[PDB]
Design a binder for these strands. Structure first.
Ligand SMILES: [Zn+2]
Lengths: 53, 317, 120
RNA sequence: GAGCGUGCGGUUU
RNA sequence: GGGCCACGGAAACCGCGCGCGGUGAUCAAUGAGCCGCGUUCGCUCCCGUGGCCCACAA
Protein backbone atom coordinates (compact mmCIF):
# COMPACT_ATOMS: atom_id res chain seq x y z
CA UNK A 1 0.00 0.00 0.00
CA UNK A 2 1.51 3.24 -1.22
CA UNK A 3 -0.96 6.15 -0.83
CA UNK A 4 -0.39 8.06 2.41
CA UNK A 5 -2.05 11.09 4.01
CA UNK A 6 -0.98 13.93 6.36
CA UNK A 7 -2.82 13.54 9.69
CA UNK A 8 -2.63 17.31 10.27
CA UNK A 9 -3.40 18.69 6.78
CA UNK A 10 -5.31 15.76 5.22
CA UNK A 11 -3.06 15.92 2.16
CA UNK A 12 -2.55 12.82 0.04
CA UNK A 13 1.02 11.96 -0.87
CA UNK A 14 3.53 9.16 -1.40
CA UNK A 15 6.14 10.85 0.80
CA UNK A 16 6.77 10.28 4.48
CA UNK A 17 6.60 13.94 5.44
CA UNK A 18 3.70 16.26 4.48
CA UNK A 19 4.99 18.37 1.57
CA UNK A 20 2.63 20.97 3.04
CA UNK A 21 2.69 20.72 6.87
CA UNK A 22 5.89 18.78 7.39
CA UNK A 23 4.19 16.20 9.65
CA UNK A 24 4.77 12.46 9.44
CA UNK A 25 2.32 10.82 7.02
CA UNK A 26 0.38 7.58 7.53
CA UNK A 27 -1.14 4.90 5.28
CA UNK A 28 -4.40 6.15 3.81
CA UNK A 29 -6.21 2.82 3.78
CA UNK A 30 -7.77 1.76 7.08
CA UNK A 31 -6.67 -1.41 8.93
CA UNK A 32 -8.17 -4.52 7.39
CA UNK A 33 -11.12 -5.89 9.39
CA UNK A 34 -12.52 -9.35 10.17
CA UNK A 35 -15.99 -10.37 11.48
CA UNK A 36 -14.25 -12.92 13.72
CA UNK A 37 -12.43 -9.88 15.16
CA UNK A 38 -10.05 -12.22 17.03
CA UNK A 39 -8.35 -9.54 19.14
CA UNK A 40 -11.36 -7.27 19.50
CA UNK A 41 -11.51 -7.92 23.24
CA UNK A 42 -8.04 -6.53 23.87
CA UNK A 43 -8.14 -3.77 21.31
CA UNK A 44 -10.98 -2.22 23.29
CA UNK A 45 -8.94 -2.42 26.47
CA UNK A 46 -6.16 -0.42 24.79
CA UNK A 47 -8.74 1.93 23.33
CA UNK A 48 -10.69 2.54 26.57
CA UNK A 49 -7.42 3.60 28.19
CA UNK A 50 -6.88 6.12 25.41
CA UNK A 51 -10.38 7.61 25.58
CA UNK A 52 -10.47 7.83 29.37
CA UNK A 53 -11.83 5.98 32.41
CA UNK B 1 -12.49 21.24 -7.49
CA UNK B 2 -16.28 21.76 -7.65
CA UNK B 3 -18.93 19.03 -7.78
CA UNK B 4 -22.60 20.01 -8.37
CA UNK B 5 -23.21 18.91 -4.76
CA UNK B 6 -21.17 21.98 -3.85
CA UNK B 7 -23.19 24.74 -5.54
CA UNK B 8 -24.13 27.54 -3.16
CA UNK B 9 -27.83 28.02 -2.40
CA UNK B 10 -29.41 31.17 -0.94
CA UNK B 11 -32.35 30.63 1.46
CA UNK B 12 -35.47 32.68 0.62
CA UNK B 13 -38.22 33.42 3.15
CA UNK B 14 -41.94 33.11 2.38
CA UNK B 15 -43.54 33.44 5.85
CA UNK B 16 -41.45 35.27 8.47
CA UNK B 17 -43.93 34.47 11.26
CA UNK B 18 -43.90 30.65 11.19
CA UNK B 19 -42.62 29.14 14.44
CA UNK B 20 -42.17 25.52 15.44
CA UNK B 21 -43.56 23.97 18.64
CA UNK B 22 -40.83 22.16 20.68
CA UNK B 23 -43.26 19.49 21.90
CA UNK B 24 -43.45 18.08 18.36
CA UNK B 25 -40.88 16.10 16.39
CA UNK B 26 -37.31 15.08 17.12
CA UNK B 27 -34.46 17.28 15.88
CA UNK B 28 -31.43 15.04 15.15
CA UNK B 29 -29.61 15.98 18.37
CA UNK B 30 -32.70 15.35 20.48
CA UNK B 31 -33.30 11.74 19.47
CA UNK B 32 -32.87 8.87 21.90
CA UNK B 33 -29.83 6.87 20.70
CA UNK B 34 -32.24 4.10 19.63
CA UNK B 35 -34.25 6.37 17.33
CA UNK B 36 -31.03 8.05 16.23
CA UNK B 37 -30.07 4.68 14.81
CA UNK B 38 -33.45 3.94 13.22
CA UNK B 39 -32.96 7.21 11.31
CA UNK B 40 -29.19 7.10 10.96
CA UNK B 41 -26.48 6.89 8.33
CA UNK B 42 -22.91 5.66 8.67
CA UNK B 43 -20.13 7.51 6.90
CA UNK B 44 -18.05 4.36 6.59
CA UNK B 45 -14.41 4.12 5.54
CA UNK B 46 -14.49 0.75 3.78
CA UNK B 47 -11.28 -1.29 4.33
CA UNK B 48 -9.58 -3.04 1.38
CA UNK B 49 -10.31 -6.72 0.77
CA UNK B 50 -14.07 -7.29 1.25
CA UNK B 51 -16.84 -6.53 -1.19
CA UNK B 52 -19.04 -3.63 -0.07
CA UNK B 53 -21.92 -6.10 0.18
CA UNK B 54 -20.09 -8.28 2.70
CA UNK B 55 -19.17 -5.23 4.76
CA UNK B 56 -22.77 -4.11 5.29
CA UNK B 57 -23.56 -7.75 6.10
CA UNK B 58 -20.99 -7.74 8.93
CA UNK B 59 -22.56 -4.56 10.17
CA UNK B 60 -26.13 -5.86 10.25
CA UNK B 61 -25.01 -8.89 12.24
CA UNK B 62 -22.79 -6.95 14.66
CA UNK B 63 -25.10 -3.99 15.26
CA UNK B 64 -28.07 -6.36 15.21
CA UNK B 65 -29.90 -4.62 12.38
CA UNK B 66 -32.50 -5.92 9.93
CA UNK B 67 -31.90 -3.45 7.09
CA UNK B 68 -29.00 -1.36 5.85
CA UNK B 69 -28.09 -0.33 2.32
CA UNK B 70 -24.83 1.19 1.15
CA UNK B 71 -24.62 3.64 -1.73
CA UNK B 72 -22.32 3.26 -4.73
CA UNK B 73 -20.74 -0.20 -4.65
CA UNK B 74 -17.00 0.16 -3.99
CA UNK B 75 -14.97 -2.60 -5.62
CA UNK B 76 -13.22 -5.14 -3.35
CA UNK B 77 -9.71 -3.65 -3.47
CA UNK B 78 -10.94 -0.06 -3.02
CA UNK B 79 -11.10 1.86 0.28
CA UNK B 80 -12.81 5.02 1.47
CA UNK B 81 -16.22 6.62 1.80
CA UNK B 82 -19.11 4.15 1.70
CA UNK B 83 -22.34 5.67 3.04
CA UNK B 84 -24.44 3.10 4.84
CA UNK B 85 -28.05 4.09 5.37
CA UNK B 86 -29.67 2.39 8.37
CA UNK B 87 -33.02 0.74 9.03
CA UNK B 88 -35.75 3.31 8.51
CA UNK B 89 -33.43 5.72 6.69
CA UNK B 90 -32.40 3.08 4.16
CA UNK B 91 -34.14 4.72 1.24
CA UNK B 92 -32.11 7.96 1.41
CA UNK B 93 -29.34 6.24 -0.53
CA UNK B 94 -31.53 7.36 -3.44
CA UNK B 95 -30.27 10.87 -2.83
CA UNK B 96 -26.72 9.50 -2.83
CA UNK B 97 -26.25 6.97 -5.65
CA UNK B 98 -26.81 9.80 -8.24
CA UNK B 99 -24.48 12.28 -6.48
CA UNK B 100 -20.95 13.04 -7.66
CA UNK B 101 -18.02 11.11 -6.22
CA UNK B 102 -14.34 11.92 -5.72
CA UNK B 103 -11.35 9.56 -5.65
CA UNK B 104 -7.63 9.70 -5.02
CA UNK B 105 -5.92 7.37 -7.42
CA UNK B 106 -2.45 5.99 -7.94
CA UNK B 107 -1.72 5.34 -11.60
CA UNK B 108 1.34 3.42 -12.73
CA UNK B 109 2.79 4.33 -16.12
CA UNK B 110 4.25 1.46 -18.12
CA UNK B 111 6.83 3.80 -19.66
CA UNK B 112 8.68 7.05 -19.08
CA UNK B 113 6.92 10.35 -19.66
CA UNK B 114 7.98 13.93 -18.79
CA UNK B 115 6.06 15.44 -15.86
CA UNK B 116 4.72 18.15 -18.20
CA UNK B 117 3.07 15.74 -20.71
CA UNK B 118 1.35 13.81 -17.96
CA UNK B 119 -0.29 16.96 -16.62
CA UNK B 120 -1.13 18.50 -19.99
CA UNK B 121 -2.66 15.22 -21.15
CA UNK B 122 -4.58 14.50 -17.95
CA UNK B 123 -6.12 17.98 -18.20
CA UNK B 124 -7.55 16.90 -21.59
CA UNK B 125 -9.66 14.27 -19.86
CA UNK B 126 -11.87 16.69 -17.95
CA UNK B 127 -15.29 16.95 -19.58
CA UNK B 128 -17.03 13.92 -21.09
CA UNK B 129 -15.76 10.36 -21.59
CA UNK B 130 -17.22 7.19 -23.09
CA UNK B 131 -16.86 3.74 -21.47
CA UNK B 132 -18.49 0.29 -21.27
CA UNK B 133 -21.67 1.84 -23.98
CA UNK B 134 -22.16 4.91 -21.77
CA UNK B 135 -21.04 8.56 -21.45
CA UNK B 136 -20.06 9.95 -18.04
CA UNK B 137 -18.64 13.25 -16.72
CA UNK B 138 -15.20 14.03 -15.26
CA UNK B 139 -15.65 17.29 -13.31
CA UNK B 140 -12.03 17.93 -12.38
CA UNK B 141 -8.66 16.20 -12.31
CA UNK B 142 -5.83 17.33 -10.06
CA UNK B 143 -2.34 15.85 -10.07
CA UNK B 144 -0.80 15.82 -6.61
CA UNK B 145 2.47 13.99 -7.11
CA UNK B 146 4.59 12.34 -9.73
CA UNK B 147 7.37 10.02 -8.57
CA UNK B 148 8.92 8.77 -11.78
CA UNK B 149 6.33 6.44 -13.24
CA UNK B 150 3.80 6.83 -10.43
CA UNK B 151 1.17 9.54 -10.69
CA UNK B 152 -1.01 10.38 -7.72
CA UNK B 153 -4.09 12.46 -8.37
CA UNK B 154 -7.55 13.44 -7.17
CA UNK B 155 -10.47 13.07 -9.52
CA UNK B 156 -14.12 14.14 -9.36
CA UNK B 157 -16.70 12.27 -11.39
CA UNK B 158 -20.38 11.72 -12.15
CA UNK B 159 -21.88 8.65 -10.46
CA UNK B 160 -21.04 5.37 -12.17
CA UNK B 161 -17.70 6.48 -13.61
CA UNK B 162 -14.96 3.84 -13.96
CA UNK B 163 -11.63 5.18 -12.76
CA UNK B 164 -9.71 2.04 -13.67
CA UNK B 165 -10.84 2.58 -17.23
CA UNK B 166 -9.98 6.30 -17.26
CA UNK B 167 -6.47 5.55 -16.11
CA UNK B 168 -6.36 3.01 -18.94
CA UNK B 169 -7.29 5.65 -21.54
CA UNK B 170 -4.78 8.08 -20.08
CA UNK B 171 -2.10 5.45 -20.55
CA UNK B 172 -3.26 5.19 -24.16
CA UNK B 173 -3.26 8.94 -24.79
CA UNK B 174 0.25 9.09 -23.34
CA UNK B 175 1.40 6.15 -25.43
CA UNK B 176 3.29 4.13 -22.84
CA UNK B 177 0.09 2.62 -21.38
CA UNK B 178 -0.99 2.58 -17.75
CA UNK B 179 -2.78 0.74 -14.96
CA UNK B 180 -4.32 1.78 -11.64
CA UNK B 181 -2.42 0.30 -8.73
CA UNK B 182 -4.47 1.88 -5.93
CA UNK B 183 -7.79 3.69 -5.48
CA UNK B 184 -9.58 5.33 -2.57
CA UNK B 185 -12.84 7.25 -2.51
CA UNK B 186 -12.65 10.46 -0.51
CA UNK B 187 -16.11 11.77 -1.26
CA UNK B 188 -19.61 10.64 -2.20
CA UNK B 189 -22.26 13.35 -2.32
CA UNK B 190 -22.45 15.04 1.13
CA UNK B 191 -20.11 12.44 2.63
CA UNK B 192 -16.51 13.63 2.99
CA UNK B 193 -13.42 12.68 5.01
CA UNK B 194 -14.03 14.59 8.24
CA UNK B 195 -14.58 13.69 11.88
CA UNK B 196 -17.64 11.67 10.83
CA UNK B 197 -15.71 9.16 8.67
CA UNK B 198 -15.40 6.11 10.92
CA UNK B 199 -13.52 2.84 10.28
CA UNK B 200 -15.10 -0.54 10.96
CA UNK B 201 -12.84 -0.99 13.98
CA UNK B 202 -13.79 2.32 15.64
CA UNK B 203 -17.40 1.56 14.84
CA UNK B 204 -17.87 -1.96 16.23
CA UNK B 205 -15.93 -0.81 19.25
CA UNK B 206 -17.95 2.35 19.95
CA UNK B 207 -21.01 0.05 19.71
CA UNK B 208 -19.75 -2.26 22.47
CA UNK B 209 -18.79 0.81 24.49
CA UNK B 210 -22.45 1.84 24.46
CA UNK B 211 -24.13 -1.57 24.55
CA UNK B 212 -21.75 -3.26 27.05
CA UNK B 213 -20.11 -0.35 28.86
CA UNK B 214 -23.02 2.10 28.71
CA UNK B 215 -21.21 5.00 27.02
CA UNK B 216 -23.28 6.74 24.36
CA UNK B 217 -21.16 9.68 23.13
CA UNK B 218 -18.78 7.75 20.94
CA UNK B 219 -21.37 5.56 19.23
CA UNK B 220 -23.71 8.50 18.75
CA UNK B 221 -20.98 10.41 16.86
CA UNK B 222 -20.57 7.32 14.69
CA UNK B 223 -24.13 7.48 13.42
CA UNK B 224 -25.28 10.53 11.49
CA UNK B 225 -28.88 11.81 11.29
CA UNK B 226 -30.51 10.97 7.96
CA UNK B 227 -30.67 14.75 7.38
CA UNK B 228 -26.96 14.53 6.59
CA UNK B 229 -27.68 12.44 3.50
CA UNK B 230 -29.60 15.40 2.15
CA UNK B 231 -27.23 18.37 2.67
CA UNK B 232 -26.65 18.54 -1.10
CA UNK B 233 -30.33 18.72 -2.09
CA UNK B 234 -32.39 21.87 -2.52
CA UNK B 235 -34.79 22.13 0.42
CA UNK B 236 -38.12 23.69 1.17
CA UNK B 237 -39.07 24.16 4.80
CA UNK B 238 -42.72 23.75 5.71
CA UNK B 239 -44.98 24.92 8.53
CA UNK B 240 -45.90 22.73 11.51
CA UNK B 241 -49.52 22.55 10.33
CA UNK B 242 -48.33 21.04 7.04
CA UNK B 243 -46.00 18.32 8.32
CA UNK B 244 -48.51 15.65 9.40
CA UNK B 245 -50.43 16.13 6.14
CA UNK B 246 -47.29 15.44 4.15
CA UNK B 247 -46.37 12.25 6.03
CA UNK B 248 -49.86 11.03 5.18
CA UNK B 249 -49.12 11.40 1.49
CA UNK B 250 -50.43 14.90 0.87
CA UNK B 251 -48.57 16.77 -1.83
CA UNK B 252 -47.15 20.05 -0.52
CA UNK B 253 -49.31 23.04 -1.38
CA UNK B 254 -47.73 26.47 -1.50
CA UNK B 255 -49.55 27.80 1.60
CA UNK B 256 -47.59 25.30 3.72
CA UNK B 257 -44.16 26.69 2.87
CA UNK B 258 -42.05 28.77 5.25
CA UNK B 259 -38.64 29.05 3.58
CA UNK B 260 -37.00 27.61 0.47
CA UNK B 261 -33.69 27.49 -1.39
CA UNK B 262 -33.33 29.67 -4.48
CA UNK B 263 -33.03 28.33 -8.01
CA UNK B 264 -35.25 25.28 -7.72
CA UNK B 265 -36.63 24.26 -11.11
CA UNK B 266 -39.68 22.17 -12.04
CA UNK B 267 -38.61 18.51 -11.98
CA UNK B 268 -35.84 18.97 -9.43
CA UNK B 269 -35.48 16.53 -6.58
CA UNK B 270 -36.01 18.44 -3.31
CA UNK B 271 -35.96 17.53 0.37
CA UNK B 272 -38.81 18.67 2.57
CA UNK B 273 -37.69 19.89 5.99
CA UNK B 274 -39.56 20.95 9.16
CA UNK B 275 -38.56 24.26 10.79
CA UNK B 276 -36.53 22.19 13.28
CA UNK B 277 -34.53 21.07 10.23
CA UNK B 278 -35.88 17.52 10.30
CA UNK B 279 -36.25 15.56 7.08
CA UNK B 280 -39.94 14.92 6.38
CA UNK B 281 -39.80 13.54 2.87
CA UNK B 282 -38.26 13.70 -0.62
CA UNK B 283 -40.17 15.11 -3.55
CA UNK B 284 -40.28 16.47 -7.08
CA UNK B 285 -40.75 20.20 -7.56
CA UNK B 286 -43.85 21.26 -9.48
CA UNK B 287 -42.81 24.92 -9.35
CA UNK B 288 -39.67 27.05 -9.53
CA UNK B 289 -38.53 28.71 -6.31
CA UNK B 290 -39.94 31.97 -7.72
CA UNK B 291 -43.42 30.60 -8.46
CA UNK B 292 -43.62 29.14 -4.95
CA UNK B 293 -42.56 32.42 -3.42
CA UNK B 294 -45.12 34.64 -5.13
CA UNK B 295 -48.07 32.27 -5.57
CA UNK B 296 -50.63 31.81 -2.78
CA UNK B 297 -52.09 28.44 -3.85
CA UNK B 298 -51.14 25.31 -5.80
CA UNK B 299 -49.05 22.14 -5.49
CA UNK B 300 -45.38 23.00 -5.04
CA UNK B 301 -43.93 19.55 -4.43
CA UNK B 302 -45.10 16.09 -5.40
CA UNK B 303 -44.31 14.09 -2.26
CA UNK B 304 -42.75 10.78 -3.36
CA UNK B 305 -40.86 9.26 -0.42
CA UNK B 306 -41.86 9.92 3.19
CA UNK B 307 -39.37 9.28 6.02
CA UNK B 308 -40.81 10.91 9.10
CA UNK B 309 -43.34 8.81 11.07
CA UNK B 310 -46.96 10.01 11.11
CA UNK B 311 -47.10 10.32 14.90
CA UNK B 312 -44.32 12.89 15.45
CA UNK B 313 -46.64 15.73 14.48
CA UNK B 314 -50.33 16.05 15.26
CA UNK B 315 -52.88 15.73 12.45
CA UNK B 316 -53.68 19.45 12.48
CA UNK B 317 -55.62 19.53 9.16
CA UNK C 1 5.31 8.27 18.94
CA UNK C 2 2.41 5.69 18.87
CA UNK C 3 -0.31 5.14 21.48
CA UNK C 4 0.35 1.43 21.97
CA UNK C 5 3.86 2.46 23.07
CA UNK C 6 3.03 2.74 26.77
CA UNK C 7 6.52 3.65 28.05
CA UNK C 8 10.08 4.81 27.25
CA UNK C 9 12.93 2.48 26.21
CA UNK C 10 16.62 3.68 26.26
CA UNK C 11 19.04 3.09 23.36
CA UNK C 12 21.09 0.74 25.55
CA UNK C 13 18.19 -1.48 26.64
CA UNK C 14 16.58 -1.51 23.19
CA UNK C 15 19.93 -2.60 21.78
CA UNK C 16 20.44 -5.18 24.52
CA UNK C 17 17.03 -6.34 23.28
CA UNK C 18 17.81 -6.90 19.60
CA UNK C 19 20.86 -8.86 20.72
CA UNK C 20 18.65 -10.93 23.01
CA UNK C 21 16.46 -12.08 20.12
CA UNK C 22 19.47 -12.54 17.83
CA UNK C 23 20.74 -15.22 20.22
CA UNK C 24 17.68 -17.42 20.80
CA UNK C 25 17.22 -17.77 17.04
CA UNK C 26 19.90 -20.49 17.10
CA UNK C 27 20.59 -21.50 20.71
CA UNK C 28 16.88 -21.66 21.51
CA UNK C 29 13.45 -21.03 20.01
CA UNK C 30 11.65 -17.87 18.83
CA UNK C 31 8.65 -16.82 16.73
CA UNK C 32 8.24 -13.79 14.45
CA UNK C 33 5.25 -11.88 13.09
CA UNK C 34 2.33 -10.53 15.10
CA UNK C 35 0.20 -13.64 14.51
CA UNK C 36 2.79 -16.18 15.65
CA UNK C 37 3.65 -13.80 18.51
CA UNK C 38 0.08 -13.24 19.67
CA UNK C 39 -0.56 -16.99 19.51
CA UNK C 40 2.49 -17.55 21.71
CA UNK C 41 1.19 -15.21 24.40
CA UNK C 42 -2.33 -16.73 24.44
CA UNK C 43 -0.48 -19.97 25.11
CA UNK C 44 1.86 -18.65 27.79
CA UNK C 45 4.89 -19.89 25.89
CA UNK C 46 6.20 -16.36 25.42
CA UNK C 47 8.88 -15.54 27.98
CA UNK C 48 9.45 -12.11 26.42
CA UNK C 49 7.51 -10.11 23.80
CA UNK C 50 9.39 -7.55 21.68
CA UNK C 51 7.29 -4.97 19.78
CA UNK C 52 8.46 -2.32 17.27
CA UNK C 53 7.76 1.40 17.67
CA UNK C 54 6.92 2.18 14.02
CA UNK C 55 3.89 0.01 13.20
CA UNK C 56 1.34 1.68 10.92
CA UNK C 57 -1.58 1.05 11.38
CA UNK C 58 -1.54 0.67 15.17
CA UNK C 59 -4.32 -1.93 15.06
CA UNK C 60 -1.63 -4.39 13.99
CA UNK C 61 -0.03 -4.53 17.45
CA UNK C 62 -2.30 -2.39 19.64
CA UNK C 63 -3.61 -5.54 21.30
CA UNK C 64 -0.22 -6.96 22.36
CA UNK C 65 0.34 -4.82 25.50
CA UNK C 66 -3.10 -5.38 27.16
CA UNK C 67 -2.64 -9.04 26.16
CA UNK C 68 0.75 -9.37 27.85
CA UNK C 69 -0.47 -7.74 31.06
CA UNK C 70 -3.33 -10.24 31.26
CA UNK C 71 -1.02 -13.26 30.89
CA UNK C 72 1.65 -11.51 32.99
CA UNK C 73 4.26 -11.60 30.20
CA UNK C 74 7.06 -8.97 29.84
CA UNK C 75 6.96 -6.87 26.68
CA UNK C 76 9.48 -4.38 25.32
CA UNK C 77 9.87 -1.92 22.44
CA UNK C 78 12.49 -1.39 19.75
CA UNK C 79 13.03 1.68 17.52
CA UNK C 80 12.42 0.02 14.14
CA UNK C 81 10.60 -2.98 12.68
CA UNK C 82 12.96 -3.33 9.71
CA UNK C 83 15.94 -3.97 11.99
CA UNK C 84 13.75 -6.24 14.13
CA UNK C 85 12.87 -8.38 11.14
CA UNK C 86 16.58 -8.39 10.36
CA UNK C 87 17.71 -9.72 13.76
CA UNK C 88 15.21 -12.61 13.67
CA UNK C 89 16.50 -14.62 10.72
CA UNK C 90 14.52 -13.02 7.91
CA UNK C 91 15.04 -10.38 5.20
CA UNK C 92 11.60 -8.78 5.53
CA UNK C 93 10.49 -6.41 8.30
CA UNK C 94 8.78 -8.05 11.29
CA UNK C 95 6.28 -6.09 13.37
CA UNK C 96 6.80 -8.05 16.60
CA UNK C 97 8.56 -11.04 18.18
CA UNK C 98 8.28 -13.55 21.03
CA UNK C 99 11.01 -15.48 22.80
CA UNK C 100 9.69 -18.98 23.43
CA UNK C 101 12.82 -20.36 25.05
CA UNK C 102 15.87 -18.18 25.88
CA UNK C 103 18.61 -20.80 25.68
CA UNK C 104 21.73 -18.69 26.05
CA UNK C 105 20.01 -15.34 26.54
CA UNK C 106 18.63 -16.33 29.95
CA UNK C 107 20.48 -13.84 32.15
CA UNK C 108 20.10 -11.25 29.38
CA UNK C 109 16.31 -11.56 29.42
CA UNK C 110 15.95 -11.63 33.20
CA UNK C 111 17.90 -8.35 33.02
CA UNK C 112 15.45 -6.90 30.51
CA UNK C 113 12.33 -8.40 32.13
CA UNK C 114 13.20 -7.04 35.59
CA UNK C 115 13.99 -3.48 34.46
CA UNK C 116 10.73 -3.10 32.54
CA UNK C 117 8.88 -3.79 35.79
CA UNK C 118 10.08 -0.30 36.72
CA UNK C 119 8.48 1.67 33.90
CA UNK C 120 4.97 0.42 34.72
C1' G D 1 -40.03 -8.43 -13.90
C1' A D 2 -36.83 -3.33 -16.46
C1' G D 3 -32.97 0.07 -14.74
C1' C D 4 -29.22 2.11 -11.04
C1' G D 5 -24.60 1.93 -7.82
C1' U D 6 -17.83 0.05 -10.90
C1' G D 7 -18.45 -6.73 -8.42
C1' C D 8 -20.03 -10.60 -8.83
C1' G D 9 -19.66 -15.66 -12.08
C1' G D 10 -21.42 -21.03 -12.98
C1' U D 11 -24.86 -25.11 -11.89
C1' U D 12 -29.66 -27.52 -11.04
C1' U D 13 -37.72 -27.64 -10.52
C1' G E 1 -60.76 5.54 -6.92
C1' G E 2 -55.81 8.64 -5.56
C1' G E 3 -51.25 9.71 -2.59
C1' C E 4 -48.20 7.51 1.16
C1' C E 5 -46.43 3.31 4.32
C1' A E 6 -45.41 -2.12 5.23
C1' C E 7 -44.59 -7.00 3.08
C1' G E 8 -43.73 -10.15 -1.55
C1' G E 9 -41.53 -10.46 -7.02
C1' A E 10 -37.24 -17.49 -5.33
C1' A E 11 -34.50 -21.31 -2.63
C1' A E 12 -30.39 -24.90 -2.63
C1' C E 13 -25.54 -26.72 -4.15
C1' C E 14 -20.58 -24.52 -6.68
C1' G E 15 -16.80 -21.07 -8.13
C1' C E 16 -13.10 -16.40 -8.52
C1' G E 17 -12.23 -12.67 -4.60
C1' C E 18 -11.74 -11.99 0.53
C1' G E 19 -10.99 -13.42 5.05
C1' C E 20 -10.71 -16.90 10.21
C1' G E 21 -8.59 -21.25 12.62
C1' G E 22 -3.96 -24.57 12.14
C1' U E 23 0.91 -24.50 10.02
C1' G E 24 4.64 -20.79 9.44
C1' A E 25 8.10 -19.65 4.55
C1' U E 26 15.00 -17.49 1.10
C1' C E 27 12.67 -9.70 -0.17
C1' A E 28 4.22 -11.17 0.97
C1' A E 29 5.93 -12.40 9.18
C1' U E 30 1.08 -5.86 8.05
C1' G E 31 1.73 -13.68 6.44
C1' A E 32 4.00 -17.78 1.12
C1' G E 33 2.01 -22.43 0.20
C1' C E 34 -0.71 -26.56 1.97
C1' C E 35 -5.20 -28.05 4.72
C1' G E 36 -10.01 -26.98 6.94
C1' C E 37 -14.06 -23.49 7.62
C1' G E 38 -16.46 -19.16 6.86
C1' U E 39 -18.40 -15.37 3.66
C1' U E 40 -22.44 -10.73 -0.67
C1' C E 41 -25.97 -4.62 0.44
C1' G E 42 -29.59 -1.99 -1.30
C1' C E 43 -32.40 1.86 -4.26
C1' U E 44 -35.70 3.40 -8.45
C1' C E 45 -39.52 2.28 -11.89
C1' C E 46 -43.49 -1.46 -12.54
C1' C E 47 -46.80 -5.53 -10.70
C1' G E 48 -49.64 -8.14 -6.55
C1' U E 49 -51.49 -8.45 -0.95
C1' G E 50 -52.40 -5.62 3.16
C1' G E 51 -52.49 -0.92 6.32
C1' C E 52 -53.04 4.61 7.04
C1' C E 53 -54.82 9.10 5.28
C1' C E 54 -57.54 12.12 1.43
C1' A E 55 -54.69 16.71 4.48
C1' C E 56 -53.89 24.35 -0.33
C1' A E 57 -51.70 24.17 6.15
C1' A E 58 -56.48 27.45 8.28
ZN1 LIG F 1 -1.60 19.52 3.17
Amino acid sequence: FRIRKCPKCGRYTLKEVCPVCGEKTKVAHPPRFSPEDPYGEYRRRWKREVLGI
Amino acid sequence: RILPADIKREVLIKDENAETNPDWGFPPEKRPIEMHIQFGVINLDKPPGPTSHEVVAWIKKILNLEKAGHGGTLDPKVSGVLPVALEKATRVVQALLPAGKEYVALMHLHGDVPEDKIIQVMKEFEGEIIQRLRTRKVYYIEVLEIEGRDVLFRVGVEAGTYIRSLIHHIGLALGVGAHMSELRRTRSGPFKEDETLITLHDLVDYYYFWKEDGIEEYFRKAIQPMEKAVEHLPKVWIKDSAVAAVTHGADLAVPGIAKLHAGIKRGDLVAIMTLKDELVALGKAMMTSQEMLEKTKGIAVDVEKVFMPRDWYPKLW
Amino acid sequence: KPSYVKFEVPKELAEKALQAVEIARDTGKIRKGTNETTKAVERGQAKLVIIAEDVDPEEIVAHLPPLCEEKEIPYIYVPSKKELGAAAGIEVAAASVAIIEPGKARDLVEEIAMKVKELM
